[PDB]
Symmetry: D2
Subunit: 120 residues, 4 copies
């Protein structure tokens, strides 16, 4: 079993910027683009034998017992970024390891994938 956790990089900053500048359009644009992006990632993971566990905000968590090419999967994730919003990912044997792996990515540059085993 493989668990992967994906989350947008520094998304709250762009949302806070829209509020402070009183820009309904950019705030609405961001919200729509995020929802559309999380849909693409979720349907991409489904096409590669993943089971969607979580799909809300700017993150998507899925699992799978089939063989997967993380290089191809995360390559697709990076291809879904818009403006300067990237996505980080963490892989592990369970939910905890995937979450801890995601923390490692978002704390070492973001826009990257971290495999829990490679953190030890």
């Amino acid at each position: 079993s493989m668990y992967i956790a994906i989350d947008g990089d520094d998304v709250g900053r762009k949302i806070t910027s829209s509020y402070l500048s009183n820009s309904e359009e950019r705030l609405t644009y961001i919200s729509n683009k995020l929802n559309d992006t999380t849909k693409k990632i979720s349907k991409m993971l489904l096409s590669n034998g993943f089971e969607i566990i979580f799909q809300a905000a700017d993150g998507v968590t899925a699992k799978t017992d089939n063989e997967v090419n993380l290089n191809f999967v995360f390559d697709k994730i990076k291809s879904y970024s818009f403006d300067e919003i990237t996505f980080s990912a963490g892989v592990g044997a369970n939910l905890r390891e995937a979450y801890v792996a995601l923390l490692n990515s978002k704390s070492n540059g973001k826009n990257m994938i971290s495999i829990y085993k490679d953190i030890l």
Copy 2:
């Protein structure tokens, strides 16, 4: 004029992180689904009271109206609370004021609604 309101869930990530660290896919997918259902009921209620939805993603909902009883709208929002998840609200004459009012509600306890003109 146009009044704005920013609604956001209280300590939403803490329940989510707890699900990851405990390897509870049940509690995780539940929070994800119930969050999407709750924000849809919040916007639906807002549309029914003369509001225009500006943002409806993650655990928050932002809207504006040119027409409103805040105790009514906030009680409706607080009636949609599920499990240990409450909602805070911020109101102002623009997005910036509504945002700072939301920050006010989340810093002085939670499950409350603040009006920007009342913080000055």
Copy 3:
């Protein structure tokens, strides 16, 4: 061999409240009291055979090769002031203690967690 990661609960919220309300006195007190509390936490840990690895902000991270974890955290609970409490995480290395801290943060507040107990 044993790492402990202590951190204050919801400190940024009480600081933000002082800003939005223009409460200089409360903000200064939070700064003073926070620095004194972390100092108290370190000396208490130094008295119990701990080596301080980290003492700044709203937390203290230390390790020990020798302890009364229950008594240690009980004084940590007592060091709370105003609306600010403290959580802690214990593990065999820095990663485990940190993950244990996040476990305490995500499961309430003013609680201590042991990494081997969350597995």
Copy 4:
């Protein structure tokens, strides 16, 4: 009367990286180098007639009733960056300086914002 709120940019990311990699050295270096940076920011604000209101964690908040050259003040803050930058907000009260700091934090950081210029 002027208020200025200063806070380090993306400090927890380097602290989290230290925990997850079991690097007591990096965690110690970060904690020490930051405390030396805030005190350096504080001494610089003192020399310019500021009254320190808050000095804890990665933040430094002060006020002053004298005219100030913010460009020089902030350029000095940028000179204190190591490896880690600092953004700041200015205003006539704590609330305005805080909102100004939020503006700098969500518009690229490593910058200074004045409340009256954001409106």
